[PDB]
Design a binder for this molecule. Sequence first.
Ligand SMILES: [Cl-]
Ligand SMILES: [Cl-]
Ligand SMILES: [Cl-]
Length: 423
Amino acid sequence: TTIKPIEYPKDHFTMEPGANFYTVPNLGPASSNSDECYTNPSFSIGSSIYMFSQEIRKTDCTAGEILSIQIVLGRIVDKGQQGPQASPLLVWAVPNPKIINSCAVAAGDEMGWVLCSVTLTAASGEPIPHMFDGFWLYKLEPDTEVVSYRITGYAYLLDKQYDSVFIGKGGGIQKGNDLYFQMYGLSRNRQSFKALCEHGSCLGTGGGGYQVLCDRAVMSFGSEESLITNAYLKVNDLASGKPVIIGQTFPPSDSYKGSNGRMYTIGDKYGLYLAPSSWNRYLRFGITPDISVRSTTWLKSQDPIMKILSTCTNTDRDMCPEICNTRGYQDIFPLSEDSEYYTYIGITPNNGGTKNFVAVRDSDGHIASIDILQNYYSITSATISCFMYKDEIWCIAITEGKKQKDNPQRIYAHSYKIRQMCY
Ligand SMILES: [Cl-]
Ligand SMILES: [Cl-]
Ligand SMILES: [Cl-]
């Protein structure tokens, strides 16, 4: 009862973030072990419960061994503070984390879901890295033992053969008897393609040089037969206890290099965020009425532009294609049915640290931003979910970062409201 799904609001009507950025302590637990990095959270809010997952890795945040994947089912509640607060209900770990490629969460009605892709295992039980051996799906519910669903070849179909599969850490959604997630990985290709290659004014050579770079940017180490692609995953047949997963791939002509994504419910339609993994660092966000590649329309707005965690050297203005890697994540949350209004967090490099802001983008392109997290040395990611709380739109933002320069990376939660105004 304390929160509800967002109700989009009904002279210039503008929206802006609230003045303050309140802490949401202990949304999930954390050890002080300086040799552990907490990274790649997934955060989903349903009707009242939330779902949260985090990878705990040894030493290295990017390639370090996954020591644990920790899951929290909780509730967003009022504890008499200035903003909404979190109450964990279940703290649980994914079995056999060394076999996991990645997992993400989806919050439902008094229950939550964890979808994980796994790699193959040797006879020793050790993982064979870079591979794919189907999925595990877990259903978490208070006062109910976790239900596990092993989903191997007989129970999934992908429109292309994937040698590796990673669930998009942004998370998934439940709609009725189905779950929807996003995944990315290595898919096999045998046909020619013309990769998406939208950019600004870029000085060319022969004229097709940038298109060649765009094609090569979606290939795996220069191989035309292994591409890094995105796919929608639909999880069918939940009530039967034998779920079936159907996957549908975005062609390179409709996507940049595959990356971590997120599914959204947007009124009676749906949304998709795709983090930049490559040379195109603008916002990549699609709206679809039925969750299909054919019906996914991309927002024209550019913000946020990913400016950290990239080997690219192109400009924010022209974004010229090149072979480079981007590893950040900064999603948005729609504040209107067409997502022409939305909130997000921006992050800019400041030598080893970052400067950060929370923002609302209005349908006319106006950006209302406020500097945030100035007491943090660096913030490197953001995922945002908003909802109704005490008769207003409130949001919770989950951010990886380092409080002080020498600290190990941790995951932090804050809240803020959305203000509605007329000028
Ligand atoms: Cl080609
Ligand atoms: Cl069913
Ligand atoms: Cl930005």
